[PDB]
Design a protein around this ligand. Structure first.
Ligand code: 0M4
Ligand code: NAG
Ligand code: NAG
Ligand code: NAG
Ligand code: NAG
Ligand code: NAG
Ligand code: NAG
Ligand code: NAG
Ligand code: NAG
Ligand code: NAG
Ligand code: NAG
Length: 339
């Protein structure tokens, strides 16, 4: 027998000890080797309830990623608590690797295998495992990158859809590549992201149809963020140690519902910390071509309020709470204590 419970997890990975890449370094000191032959027991006729929005695994991963960034991505100047911290800010090697989360003895991880599981409620197909799949701690806003894809239909996740204050996570069942480059050769901070318009608009259309299922067939409208910090109004992410801020207005217009979509981007040195601890300044971009090709596997949306007396629902790209990023991958897991 077992029961819902919280415990201190540990991590496993395939990090390389000789690698200077910061994720590899962190995992080499903070994790253990993965199990080449992991066991998974499928529970028969066992119904378990899950709540992705109240899952301590999320807080723990958040804590790891904060620790990793605090140890490997120190800015030149930190502005937190009214105090000023000046440190050395050397360029680093940066590229997220898969991190596994595992339970100690006496505990096990329950995994929901229902094809269209939305993250909350009962689950029919449950299995037990010692470790989650390899999860890359990719930090971003608006768009979820290099994540896992839904297996069947596109899934809509939210602690409470009726509450517009609750973030919506869109889980795609098909990747859409985004190609971001800061050309070698001028404005060293100028950059751009390219995206196949035909693929994107087709996916966004599918997302529209899915949202209809959850909103009584009301008309679904996309719009760019109304306000807020740059980290939220724009698609922000880290590519090779550099912070990219991309204008996604071209992605979220309802006109295309086919050529290459070119999003204007800029590399910023001064950032609002996702750890929510003030601002940070980093050194200028490294020389040469700075390029990252990522899979868009999910979208973070916020719904406009005050539309109850209309046939429209308005959705704008959002984010800013990186815990939602971890939820998008940890939704199917929960920890239980064994007898
Ligand atoms: O600052 C952040 N969040 C906090 C706010 C989002 C919600 C309200 C908070 C007020 N300031 C913005 C943030 O995510 N920053 C941030 C920084 C770098 C990257 Cl790569 C990123 F993806 C996000
Ligand atoms: C349970 O999981 C299996 C395997 O993925 C799937 O075929 C089935 O549709 C799911 N639904 C049930 C019956 O629990
Ligand atoms: C990008 O997505 C494709 C599937 O669409 C996958 O094969 C590939 O491994 C992904 N790359 C990542 C996650 O870095
Ligand atoms: C993606 O999900 C949608 C429903 O949300 C479905 O219509 C479509 O067939 C799915 N595509 C793939 C690649 O499975
Ligand atoms: C997930 O499914 C449960 C019922 O199993 C339902 O109460 C909840 O509204 C669903 N979540 C979403 C976001 O649709
Ligand atoms: C969901 O949000 C709505 C709107 O704020 C609220 O009225 C309702 O009580 C919430 N539902 C739950 C389950 O708390
Ligand atoms: C990414 O886009 C750049 C645009 O300059 C292009 O040179 C490169 O071939 C693209 N890479 C992939 C994997 O499509
Ligand atoms: C754009 O996407 C379509 C599929 O929707 C694909 O067939 C085509 O090759 C893509 N165009 C380019 C320029 O690669
Ligand atoms: C949306 O409209 C279709 C029309 O075929 C209907 O079948 C379906 O029940 C409607 N869904 C909602 C959530 O209103
Ligand atoms: C994105 O680009 C559009 C078109 O140039 C512009 O109107 C809008 O203000 C930009 N968004 C942000 C957040 O700067
Ligand atoms: C996504 O994965 C690809 C392949 O490993 C990588 O090149 C790219 O930099 C990743 N994107 C981000 C934002 O980390």
């Amino acid at each position: 027998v077992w029961k819902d419970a919280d415990t201190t997890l540990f991590c496993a990975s395939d990090a390389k000890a000789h690698e200077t890449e910061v994720h590899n370094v962190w995992a080499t000191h903070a994790c253990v080797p993965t199990d080449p032959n992991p066991q998974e027991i499928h529970l028969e006729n066992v119904t378990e309830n899950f709540n992705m929005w109240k899952n301590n695994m999320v807080e723990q991963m958040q804590e790891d990623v904060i620790s990793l960034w605090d140890q490997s991505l120190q800015p030149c100047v930190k502005l937190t608590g009214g105090s000023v911290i000046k440190q050395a800010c050397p360029k680093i090697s940066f590229d997220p690797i898969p991190i596994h989360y595992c339970t100690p003895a006496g505990y096990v991880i329950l995994k929901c295998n229902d094809k269209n599981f939305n993250g909350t409620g009962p689950c029919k197909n449950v299995s037990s495992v010692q470790c989650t799949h390899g999860i890359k701690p990719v930090v971003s806003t608006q768009l979820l990158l290099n994540g896992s894809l839904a297996e069947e239909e596109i899934i809509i996740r939210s602690e409470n859809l009726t509450n517009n204050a609750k973030t919506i996570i869109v889980h795609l069942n098909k990747s859409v590549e985004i190609n971001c480059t800061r050309p070698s050769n001028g404005d060293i901070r100028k950059a751009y992201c390219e995206i196949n318009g035909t693929k994107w608009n087709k996916v966004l259309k599918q997302v529209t149809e899915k949202l209809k299922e959850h909103f009584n067939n009301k008309t679904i409208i996309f719009q760019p963020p109304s306000g807020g910090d740059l980290e939220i109004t724009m698609h922000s992410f880290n590519c090779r140690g550099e912070f990219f801020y991309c204008n996604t207005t071209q992605l979220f217009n309802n006109t295309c519902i086919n050529g290459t979509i070119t999003l204007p981007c800029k590399i910023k040195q001064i950032i609002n910390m996702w750890q929510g601890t003030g601002q940070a300044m980093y050194a200028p971009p490294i020389d040469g071509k700075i390029n990252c090709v990522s899979n868009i596997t999910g979208i973070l949306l916020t719904r406009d309020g005050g539309a109850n007396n209309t046939s429209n629902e308005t959705f704008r790209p959002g984010g800013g709470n990186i815990k939602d990023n971890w939820r998008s991958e940890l939704y199917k897991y929960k920890v239980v204590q064994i007898e």
